[PDB]
Design a binder for these strands. Sequence first.
RNA 1: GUAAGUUUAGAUUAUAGCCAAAAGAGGGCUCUUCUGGAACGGAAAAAACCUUUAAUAGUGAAUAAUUAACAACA
Lengths: 96, 49, 59, 70, 103, 159, 121, 55
Amino acid sequence: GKELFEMWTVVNPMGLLVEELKKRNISAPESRLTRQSGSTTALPLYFVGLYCDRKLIAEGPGETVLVAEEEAARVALRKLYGFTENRRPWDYSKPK
Amino acid sequence: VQKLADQSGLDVIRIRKPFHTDNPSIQGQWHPFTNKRTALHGLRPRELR
Amino acid sequence: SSFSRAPQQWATFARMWYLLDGKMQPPGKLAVIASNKLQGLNKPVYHQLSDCGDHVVII
Amino acid sequence: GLKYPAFIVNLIKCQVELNRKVLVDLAIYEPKTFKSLAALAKRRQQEGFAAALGDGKEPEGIFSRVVQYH
Amino acid sequence: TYSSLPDDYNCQVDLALTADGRTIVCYHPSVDIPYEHTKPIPQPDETHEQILKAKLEVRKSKQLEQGPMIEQLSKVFYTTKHRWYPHGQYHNRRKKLNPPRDR
Amino acid sequence: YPQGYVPKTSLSSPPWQEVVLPDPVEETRHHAEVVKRVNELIATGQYGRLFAVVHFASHQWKVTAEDLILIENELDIKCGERIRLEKVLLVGADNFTLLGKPLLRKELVRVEATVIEKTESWPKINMKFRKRKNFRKKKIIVNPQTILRINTIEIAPRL
Amino acid sequence: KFTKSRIPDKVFQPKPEDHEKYGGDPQNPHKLHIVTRIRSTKRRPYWEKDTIKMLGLQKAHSPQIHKNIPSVNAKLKVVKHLIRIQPLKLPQGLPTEETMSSTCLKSTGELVVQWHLKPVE
Amino acid sequence: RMHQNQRERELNNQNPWTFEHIATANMFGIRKFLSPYDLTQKGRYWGKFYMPKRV
RNA sequence: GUAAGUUUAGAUUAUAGCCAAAAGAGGGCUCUUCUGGAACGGAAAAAACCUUUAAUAGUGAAUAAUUAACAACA
């Protein structure tokens, strides 16, 4: 029940993401605003999606565009490293 | 004596729910934007462009 | 899925803005739609103690 | 786009015996699975409408076939 | 296009029956947002605290008195004024120190 | 103008719109193709966590691995013992789900659980409404309980 | 004064159309009744309360087996409004000592002598 | 003509259920709520009032 | 169809009812006679009308009663 970044502290997640994408020779992502609500009020909701080659890789929610954009980076990283929430459960079945 | 063996030391008091899960969702928790269609150019209603 | 705890909670309980057009409509039928969204009965996460209403704008 | 009576009744005619408590869990926590069930109930409703309007001996719907036990 | 629900918002539903007729198989892949349906981020001009301070601007009388301050707060968050007043010592001492947490 | 023709009016046609169902012959072919794809996904093991709906005792539980369940009666099983839940109504993954009518076949799905604790409930007060109620015309009810931990959910390519 | 009443005999003489509707041949009459109580005896006269106890119909929605003979029928007519009568049916024959432990009654009124809990196929 | 009309109404009535059958056969135990005269009058008379359309 | 009934021995309390639905009798009361009732659901609140075989734990399920009904000619 522990999320990755709760056990590992990473500042500037976007910077780490850029380097990782370079290693696999992928283009830098393009940030865009997928969904929006209540922008002018004091309780706004933002969805920001990182698009690569006009193809969606990750989407994240946040209170502000900067916060939401940073959230999208963490979602992307988790998928790359295969530490997603819906990943295969660990295996204690083996008696050996 | 047998009852004591089976028990764990946790307090015997009202238990709020019978079921506990740390991974309730596999497909993603519901939020208002699920089940809402997107629009071309991301135009909010009545915005002229 | 795979969001952090706080953004996940923020997204689920966010409040939405809606628009209704009242030209030539009967006032009673307009009220039924507006009352549904004001209480929050359009959300599967509705509870009487959760304050899950939305904004409604009528013209 | 479904009313409550139509959704619940048609699932029963498909031999699905999920109770109301578990259905709420799927809608909140399994949005894609709930949508699949929504289409199934709608289709069975349409098959019933076609069988009603058409009269005489006609083939029964694909999802309107009832498995039997003994 | 056998599915009776449009496939354009949440997922694509494909329903099939097994040969024996005892099981129903569901295939529901997710739908991604098209690039043509997005907007660019407004990079030119943000912490939520900064938004609040602009909203809760202190203009006249320096720190306002209770009443006028509460009326300002109610407008920003779309509530009534009654929400914002304090309570007595009887109610404050009943409150739980350590309420339970589920996960 | 053919016989039995009515000019279009407000009440001429029903409010609902009639639909045309797909033909049976082509649909069966499509059904077989869909089943084939899903079976390959199971065979290649392209899935993550699985969740199942299991009928146990007299109740239905949505379940997943590592979950805790509370049963409000004694079971006759020792602590630390493994069990198999045999009435399963639904198994699901990220991209596909399987529905029984009303139960899935034994081959497809296997769910195993373990007995963790055997206990009793906290005292519950029952006090019937009667004239001259009194404070001592009262009963305390305590019931036995057991706790199960779900261990694994498995599927096999036999659709 | 409210008192016991006697039904006219014509009520129990059927008509040809009734035989078609309910599907019972006026020959080869069935032997055993299935009776269930589907209403309450409160607010009813005491004679109806006593008969319901004689016929064993104390619990509602539980079937009781009785003989289709005139003496029994005289009592059933008294409480006709509180009960439901269905004729018994034995598609696979009367149960024997071998099959006594495998019978099961369906809602249709059929006492099958084999119950496997498996798809018919 | 009134008597002839009354006969016509009874013969062509499309209601399967009539006051006379239910009262005489005590369906529902309806006789708990009725008077002896109801069997004779067959629901056409109530107190001193005559009902012209009751069949 | 069904499980009570008589005899022997011992023992108090009670001896003013209430409303609904029938049939009468003195003319709205007042008596006499047969039936029913005393919800935690329903009829707006609701002793007396209607649904309701006892009483226990459960984040299961099928049902009962259920104040509403759809101004001319012909």
